[PDB]
Amino acid sequence: MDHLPIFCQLRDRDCLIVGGGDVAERKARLLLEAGARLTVNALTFIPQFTVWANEGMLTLVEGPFDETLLDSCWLAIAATDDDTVNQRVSDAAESRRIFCNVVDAPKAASFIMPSIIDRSPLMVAVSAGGTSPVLARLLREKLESLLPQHLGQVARYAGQLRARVKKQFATMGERRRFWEKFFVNDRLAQSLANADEKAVNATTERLFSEPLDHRGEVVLVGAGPGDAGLLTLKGLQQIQQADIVVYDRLVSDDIMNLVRRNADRVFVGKVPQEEINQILLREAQKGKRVVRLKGGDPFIFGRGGEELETLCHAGIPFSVVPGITAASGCSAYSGIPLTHRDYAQSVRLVTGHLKTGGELDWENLAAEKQTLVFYMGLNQAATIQEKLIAFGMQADMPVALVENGTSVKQRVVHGVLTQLGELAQQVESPALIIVGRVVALRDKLNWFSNH
Amino acid sequence: MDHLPIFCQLRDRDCLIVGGGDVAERKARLLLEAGARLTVNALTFIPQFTVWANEGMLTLVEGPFDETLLDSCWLAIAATDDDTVNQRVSDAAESRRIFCNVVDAPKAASFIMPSIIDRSPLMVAVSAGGTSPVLARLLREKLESLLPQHLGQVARYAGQLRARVKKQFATMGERRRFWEKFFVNDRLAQSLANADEKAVNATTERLFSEPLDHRGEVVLVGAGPGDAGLLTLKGLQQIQQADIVVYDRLVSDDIMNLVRRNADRVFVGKRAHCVPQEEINQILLREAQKGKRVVRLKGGDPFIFGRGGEELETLCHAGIPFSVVPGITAASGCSAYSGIPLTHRDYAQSVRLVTGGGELDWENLAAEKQTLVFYMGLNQAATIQEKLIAFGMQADMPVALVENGTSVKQRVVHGVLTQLGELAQQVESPALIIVGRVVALRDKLNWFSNH
Ligand SMILES: Nc1ncnc2c1ncn2[C@@H]1O[C@H](CSCC[C@H](N)C(=O)O)[C@@H](O)[C@H]1O
Ligand SMILES: Nc1ncnc2c1ncn2[C@@H]1O[C@H](CSCC[C@H](N)C(=O)O)[C@@H](O)[C@H]1O
């Protein structure tokens, strides 16, 4: 990330503003509301600074820049229209390791002042680092319309209850469940905004009195096939609140960025199945919220049933959030719809790597008017070609392989069935093989990329 | 104001973390992502730290906290479990005017770490001053769903274009209307993320060529099977940006409640008076030809028995840009929410999604090692049971019917094949017929509750 947002406690800490114009005044007003001990150093001052100075709210130093005024400071702001002066300020701040903002030069000097949405004590800060002030302001207004103006009172009351919550609830999980009920209780928010203290108390005492669940839980969450935008809203909620996230190699890097930063992550990629069940079983017995993040959809060639059998065998509660399976994602993003008019009566999702000497029912798979989608069939692509042809599929049946479907690394190769073996040499796992007349729709429906 | 939010430039600046456990690992990952020149001081380090050190990512100093490690530091984080050590760290940072965070004691320090939504260079930070970390996480979750993953690339590109935008739009009112359709242009964001560097210039040059009023495009969005939580992040983002939403009765009202206020809605579903597909095709064409951002919302997944292919061919001839957001198909939703996985161990080599029109290959559907999922099949249900018994499927094959899958009114009826015709009258559209051995697992994996 380009910047690290922090929320600084400036109360009674010295800060310096150099410059005495309109820009300096708006930054000074901010620092004053944050309680800073403020010095302003400038050749001239607009009248607002004299009004602040006679109220004793800051110190004015009328004159050129004095570097020694930085000696006690925690923050420095260069707010003159003289870039030579602003750079002397920035240089002096740098040598002293004082974070310094140069208002007219965001890319220089060590901090940026963001746009602020204030629901005190709740605060939201927005900045595009100076690369796009219009987007920061567009975003700032949208956030203004979505944050209710009684949220400050809800947050203020939360702060007042924190000691009691810590005293009455022993486990972190029991305290988080209390807070999760607290922050979605609309009647409590309303009673706070109305200063209705009998109602605040009645709801609060009931909240403290509820039996808060003590169980751990396992949620199986389909990550989708790669693109982070293909996570479901419920899936995002689970990994934004998980204690632990058990993920594999087929969950994309972008989806792992949506995981709550405070969550522990355990990789189980290449690990057999007997092991994954074990991690899930024991992390859930610790009373922790566990998410098993699986590529695609958990119940389509994902051994999701096997993970849930063990937890049912152990009395551990669980749920399942379905995901965009690889077939749907690659279909959408390659421009190959899985059904279309009477091209396809049926869609077949097939595994290409099977148990022991188990054989696919090739005469069944070769039937017309269907779309075949082979999962993990890359290394058997030459056998699929041979078998489909031998069991009657026409030689010029279109085929496509979609490698890393829906991601920015997506590659699609396509051809006819007699090419399937050669085409598979040109991609690598993870890839889908799609066989069917719908493949020819690609050059009309492909919106995603030339790769 | 209690805390002043600032966005710090940390690249190549010395920062110090004291502590070497899981808490310090989370803070260190954040400061590494910000490019800090990081030293970590701890009595011991969890292995993730020695990995970072071996990779040259940071510096490890093993031993008790040493004040002089602060001597050139810009930020300090106390991340140990020992209050006495955290206090020594915070006292030593205070006397050096180094902003310091005590992870376990947010008001004992000089800065708070807020929740971060990272779309660099665009950044959003949420904090309530330690009063409400759960509220901050809830807000961060909401914002994470609203802000597209590649927004940052759009932000950076806007910055390169500011020069050109000013000297081509006189009034600042126009310039903003330009930016407003700029930061929502789907193909611009996709073309930036895919490094398709001439599609970027192709859609950049057109953005100035089009009349400022013209935002004409069609997005096919899969609404998923009913539960509003099963919409994708990307689907929600597209719905929030639409001028017009064209939807049908199989789009749940929970999903329609997510489409924002002043968007036009066009209902093309059944009113009794069947609507043929061609008039639907014309409506999208018509609404997109007036320069409006059109979202075609469809139940489930657009490319699985949704005729979505048919709607995009109408647009391809007219030169109307389109894209597709896949959705959770009914088979995936009903499988997760009825505890019937579509695959499991070696119960099924293949999953077949089939419609119930055209003529069914009955010998083919009766073959073993399949999970059969019948879409739109309730009418032919009596025929389906008769034909599958007559073509060799065992009479004791488990069947299930899932009606209104994933909604608060979902009903699931299950028996064996020879009762399939009877069970079908007990449900109504929309319903799935699932035939296969996996159906027996619902007894163990059903976590939703039946209505
Ligand atoms: N992004 C992707 N592009 C192409 N194929 C993918 C893919 N992600 C997963 N797959 C396919 O899925 C196989 C793993 S089997 C697990 C699939 C997952 N449960 C789902 O529903 O999609 C891979 O071998 C590959 O064939
Ligand atoms: N919520 C739901 N529960 C059960 N079946 C559903 C369903 N929603 C859609 N269906 C099935 O889908 C059929 C309409 S065809 C459209 C299906 C959609 N494109 C999808 O991908 O799911 C209905 O006849 C019904 O069989």
Numbering used by the authors:
A (entry chain A): 1 to 270, 277 to 457
B (entry chain B): 1 to 272, 275 to 358, 363 to 457
Published text:
Siroheme is the modified isobacteriochlorin tetrapyrrole used by siroheme-dependent sulfite and nitrite reductases (SiR/NiRs) in catalyzing the six-electron reduction of sulfite to sulfide or nitrite to ammonia. CysG is encoded by a gene fusion between a C-terminal SUMT (CysGA) and an N-terminal bifunctional dehydrogenase/ferrochelatase (CysGB). The N-terminal enzyme module, CysGB, is a three-domain bifunctional dehydrogenase/ATP-independent class III ferrochelatase12 that performs the final two steps of siroheme biosynthesis. The C-terminal enzyme module, CysGA, is homologous to a well-studied class of SAM-dependent uro’gen III methyltransferases (SUMTs) that catalyzes the methylations to generate precorrin-210,13.
D262 comes from the CysGA module, opposing D104 but adjacent to R260/R261 and sitting above the tetrapyrrole nitrogens. Therefore, we wanted to know if D262 from CysGA was important for catalysis, so we altered it to an alanine or an asparagine (D262A or D262N). No gross structural defects were apparent. Both complemented cysG deficiency, but the altered enzymes produced the fluorescent intermediate, with defects in the dehydrogenase and chelatase activities. D262N was more affected by increasing Co2+ than CysG. R261A, D262A, and D262N retain some activity for both chemistries. Given that both D262 variants retain activity, however, and its absence from Met8p, we conclude that in CysG, D262 is not strictly required. It does, however, interact with an arginine that directly binds the sirohydrochlorin, so helps form the active site to bind the tetrapyrrole in the correct orientation. P133G behaves similarly to D262N: strongly affected by increasing cobalt concentrations.
